[PDB]
């Protein structure tokens, strides 16, 4: 389906994210993000912080257990040599915050793709400080075309994958610990 939609969790995988990427057209740097909620909690959109880039998509609002959300972002339009870098936050029904970092650089001569996922205690807005934590201090994962698992605390764990290209895909599955 499309960026901004909530879909059946079983429909998330690389091919729907390739479709989301294609729908953005041939911009230099862009990302399709899919997150499968198998957490046993409903998620409610909080906000998205863009360090670089933009999205025309509203974060999918309410994401029940058994659903996945689809989202996208792209570099700022025009003659700016920048990528797409930001943090998505969702509130979970337990009162905590699920946060997801993505970082897709302009210049692959020197930079590469990164991502991260964390649960924050309480209700925490995505912002520059959260970006800095997730990027510099909380052991982000490379977008290396491989899967990476990590415990999140709070009765949850993550398993996710990001490709290594400037037309990026980020696929994350949040499950019970």
From Swiss-Prot:
Cell cycle as UniProt keyword? no
Q: Where is this region: N-terminal alpha-helix that contributes to the pore?
A: 1-27
Which residues participate in an N-(acyl)-sphingosylphosphocholine 2 binding?
51-52, 83, 106, 111
Query: Where N-acetyl-D-glucosamine 6-sulfate is bound, by residue?
Result: 49, 51, 136
Which cell locations does it reside in? Secreted; Nematocyst; Target cell membrane
What residues bind an N-(acyl)-sphingosylphosphocholine 5, as annotated? 112, 142
Q: Which family does it belong to?
A: Belongs to the actinoporin family. Sea anemone subfamily.
Protein name in the entry: DELTA-actitoxin-Afr1a
């Amino acid at each position: 389906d499309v960026a901004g939609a909530v879909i059946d969790g079983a429909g998330l995988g690389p091919d729907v994210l390739k479709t989301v990427l294609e729908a953005l057209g041939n911009v230099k740097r862009k990302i399709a993000v899919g997150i499968d909620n198998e957490s046993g909690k409903t998620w409610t959109a909080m906000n998205t912080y863009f360090r670089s880039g933009t999205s025309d998509i509203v974060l999918p609002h309410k994401v029940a257990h058994g659903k996945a959300l689809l989202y996208n972002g792209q570099k700022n339009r025009g003659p700016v040599a920048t990528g797409v870098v930001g943090v998505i936050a969702y509130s979970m029904s337990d009162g905590n915050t699920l946060a997801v970092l993505f970082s897709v650089p302009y210049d692959y001569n020197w930079y590469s793709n990164w991502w991260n996922v964390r649960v924050y205690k309480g209700q925490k807005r995505a912002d520059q400080r959260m970006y800095e934590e997730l990027y510099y201090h909380r052991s982000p994962f490379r977008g290396d075309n491989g899967w990476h698992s990590r415990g999140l605390g709070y009765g949850l764990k993550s398993r996710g994958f990001m490709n290594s290209s400037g037309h990026a895909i980020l696929e994350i599955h949040v499950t019970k610990a």
